[PDB]
Design an enzyme around this catalytic site. Sequence first.
Site, PDB file in Angstrom:
ATOM      1  CG  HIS A  46      38.678  48.030  14.064  1.00  0.00           C
ATOM      2  ND1 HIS A  46      38.465  49.004  15.035  1.00  0.00           N
ATOM      3  CD2 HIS A  46      38.993  46.875  14.710  1.00  0.00           C
ATOM      4  CE1 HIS A  46      38.661  48.452  16.235  1.00  0.00           C
ATOM      5  NE2 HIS A  46      39.017  47.172  16.035  1.00  0.00           N
ATOM      6  CG  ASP A  47      36.193  45.264  16.250  1.00  0.00           C
ATOM      7  OD1 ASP A  47      36.347  44.353  15.408  1.00  0.00           O
ATOM      8  OD2 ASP A  47      36.981  45.386  17.265  1.00  0.00           O
TER       9      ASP A  47
ATOM     10  CD  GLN B 228      44.666  39.133  29.249  1.00  0.00           C
ATOM     11  OE1 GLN B 228      45.382  39.941  28.663  1.00  0.00           O
ATOM     12  NE2 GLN B 228      43.570  38.630  28.715  1.00  0.00           N
TER      13      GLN B 228
ATOM     14  CG  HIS C  79      37.613  47.637  20.936  1.00  0.00           C
ATOM     15  ND1 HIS C  79      38.916  47.470  21.275  1.00  0.00           N
ATOM     16  CD2 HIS C  79      37.469  47.125  19.696  1.00  0.00           C
ATOM     17  CE1 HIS C  79      39.546  46.852  20.300  1.00  0.00           C
ATOM     18  NE2 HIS C  79      38.656  46.649  19.287  1.00  0.00           N
TER      19      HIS C  79
ATOM     20  CG  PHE D  93      46.660  37.887  24.474  1.00  0.00           C
ATOM     21  CD1 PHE D  93      46.517  37.555  23.136  1.00  0.00           C
ATOM     22  CD2 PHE D  93      46.261  39.145  24.907  1.00  0.00           C
ATOM     23  CE1 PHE D  93      46.001  38.479  22.236  1.00  0.00           C
ATOM     24  CE2 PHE D  93      45.730  40.058  24.009  1.00  0.00           C
ATOM     25  CZ  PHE D  93      45.594  39.715  22.677  1.00  0.00           C
TER      26      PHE D  93
ATOM     27  CG  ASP E 124      42.030  45.286  17.014  1.00  0.00           C
ATOM     28  OD1 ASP E 124      41.150  45.733  17.773  1.00  0.00           O
ATOM     29  OD2 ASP E 124      41.845  44.319  16.206  1.00  0.00           O
TER      30      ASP E 124
ATOM     31  CG  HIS F   8      34.784  42.959  19.941  1.00  0.00           C
ATOM     32  ND1 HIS F   8      34.902  41.681  20.498  1.00  0.00           N
ATOM     33  CD2 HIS F   8      35.992  43.259  19.399  1.00  0.00           C
ATOM     34  CE1 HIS F   8      36.149  41.262  20.300  1.00  0.00           C
ATOM     35  NE2 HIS F   8      36.835  42.210  19.619  1.00  0.00           N
TER      36      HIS F   8
ATOM     37  CG  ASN G 259      42.764  46.267  25.186  1.00  0.00           C
ATOM     38  OD1 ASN G 259      41.927  45.378  25.064  1.00  0.00           O
ATOM     39  ND2 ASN G 259      42.631  47.491  24.676  1.00  0.00           N
TER      40      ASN G 259
HETATM   41  C1  J2E Z   1      42.535  42.481  26.972  1.00  0.00           C
HETATM   42  O1  J2E Z   1      42.654  41.180  26.402  1.00  0.00           O
HETATM   43  C2  J2E Z   1      42.367  40.970  25.073  1.00  0.00           C
HETATM   44  C3  J2E Z   1      42.006  41.911  24.115  1.00  0.00           C
HETATM   45  C4  J2E Z   1      41.758  41.527  22.792  1.00  0.00           C
HETATM   46  C5  J2E Z   1      41.850  40.187  22.404  1.00  0.00           C
HETATM   47  C6  J2E Z   1      41.662  39.716  21.019  1.00  0.00           C
HETATM   48  N1  J2E Z   1      42.589  39.019  20.443  1.00  0.00           N
HETATM   49  N2  J2E Z   1      41.909  38.030  19.768  1.00  0.00           N
HETATM   50  C7  J2E Z   1      42.508  36.670  19.556  1.00  0.00           C
HETATM   51  C8  J2E Z   1      41.616  35.745  18.717  1.00  0.00           C
HETATM   52  C9  J2E Z   1      42.231  34.402  18.326  1.00  0.00           C
HETATM   53  C10 J2E Z   1      41.979  33.253  19.289  1.00  0.00           C
HETATM   54  C11 J2E Z   1      42.509  33.490  20.693  1.00  0.00           C
HETATM   55  C12 J2E Z   1      42.090  34.815  21.300  1.00  0.00           C
HETATM   56  C13 J2E Z   1      42.920  36.026  20.880  1.00  0.00           C
HETATM   57  C14 J2E Z   1      40.712  38.509  19.333  1.00  0.00           C
HETATM   58  O2  J2E Z   1      39.980  38.048  18.487  1.00  0.00           O
HETATM   59  C15 J2E Z   1      40.426  39.762  20.145  1.00  0.00           C
HETATM   60  C16 J2E Z   1      40.341  40.987  19.223  1.00  0.00           C
HETATM   61  C17 J2E Z   1      39.131  39.563  20.938  1.00  0.00           C
HETATM   62  C18 J2E Z   1      42.232  39.246  23.358  1.00  0.00           C
HETATM   63  C19 J2E Z   1      42.481  39.616  24.682  1.00  0.00           C
HETATM   64  O3  J2E Z   1      42.811  38.642  25.598  1.00  0.00           O
HETATM   65  C20 J2E Z   1      42.063  37.406  25.408  1.00  0.00           C
HETATM   66  C21 J2E Z   1      41.604  36.855  26.753  1.00  0.00           C
HETATM   67  C22 J2E Z   1      42.666  35.863  27.168  1.00  0.00           C
HETATM   68  C23 J2E Z   1      43.737  35.943  26.139  1.00  0.00           C
HETATM   69  C24 J2E Z   1      43.030  36.373  24.892  1.00  0.00           C
HETATM   70 MG    MG Z   2      37.800  42.907  15.033  1.00  0.00          MG
HETATM   71 ZN    ZN Z   3      39.024  45.459  17.475  1.00  0.00          ZN
END
Ligand code: J2E
Ligand code: MG
Ligand code: ZN
Length: 330
Positions: free
Chosen positions: A119-120, A288, A83, A291, A237, A79, A240
Amino acid sequence: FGVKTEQEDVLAKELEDVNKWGLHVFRIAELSGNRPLTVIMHTIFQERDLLKTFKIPVDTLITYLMTLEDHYHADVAYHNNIHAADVVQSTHVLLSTPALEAVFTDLEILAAIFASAIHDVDHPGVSNQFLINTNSELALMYNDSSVLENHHLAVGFKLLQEENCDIFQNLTKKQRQSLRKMVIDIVLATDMSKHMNLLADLKTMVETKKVTSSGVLLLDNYSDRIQVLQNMVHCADLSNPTKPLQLYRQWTDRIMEEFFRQGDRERERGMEISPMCDKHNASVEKSQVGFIDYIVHPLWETWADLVHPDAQDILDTLEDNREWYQSTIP
Ligand SMILES: COc1ccc(C2=NN(C3CCCCCC3)C(=O)C2(C)C)cc1OC1CCCC1
Ligand SMILES: [Mg+2]
Ligand SMILES: [Zn+2]
């Protein structure tokens, strides 16, 4: 001289990719002396003719951008200013999608790009829940409600008051009130607690989409125009996993460094370790894939529907990256 240094020339050549998904943003960070947000914002403002449109003095723009970039923490792995630069540049590419051609006003474009840049800002590299659970000053100031996102807005706006930083000094009060409300609505929508309701609303809009002037999206009320901008910056946001894998893996390394450091602070304090923050109990690949499957693909599949077929290559890259991480689950 009155001509660029050789380092400035190599930077200018990389910045020719500013209109492309997959910009070498880490290389821009290195070449600019850790000024990726300043150089990418300046490039976008010049490309979109925003200094002329909004009568922004160029010295004021540069002073504000350096000030803003300086309030991103260089000791935070994810962050940070890189980013911020990436979300700005990804928003800039999404705003240029053929399906949105001539849809947004210059003020809405300025709102989306400025929102992306701030935004961050001043992110401490820990989650809202961490700040709430530690009784942090930020959580108390914002009554535990979108703590970080409220803070990013407050800092991004307060920095306009530093010496020669007021980039909006020539906007009318009407322009400033409209810009300010849009920027607040966009950054508050980056709180992941809002994701399921934003996605529900984007799906409703795709279901009842109108495509007026024979090709382009029809958005005829504030509710629909701001929902598209909110989802667009939220897509940026969460972009990625949609980038070429060499970029995605750098972002994954950084977010896991940040998450593991938060988990180290939770473990040393005897707190419950947050999801995916335990370096001793980590499944980076599985995380990942989860996610992408539960958050990123449902969002980007719905965005791709709104702008069909403009985002097909982005969705295909996301699907290839998902298959790659799945294939490396040990
Ligand atoms: C490249 O991998 C990632 C890039 C960004 C994120 C994010 N998503 N979120 C949420 C929050 C809610 C709770 C659960 C987490 C996801 C965030 O708060 C941020 C902006 C940090 C997440 C990314 O991947 C992460 C690592 C493993 C999977 C989530
Ligand atoms: Mg943010
Ligand atoms: Zn962000």
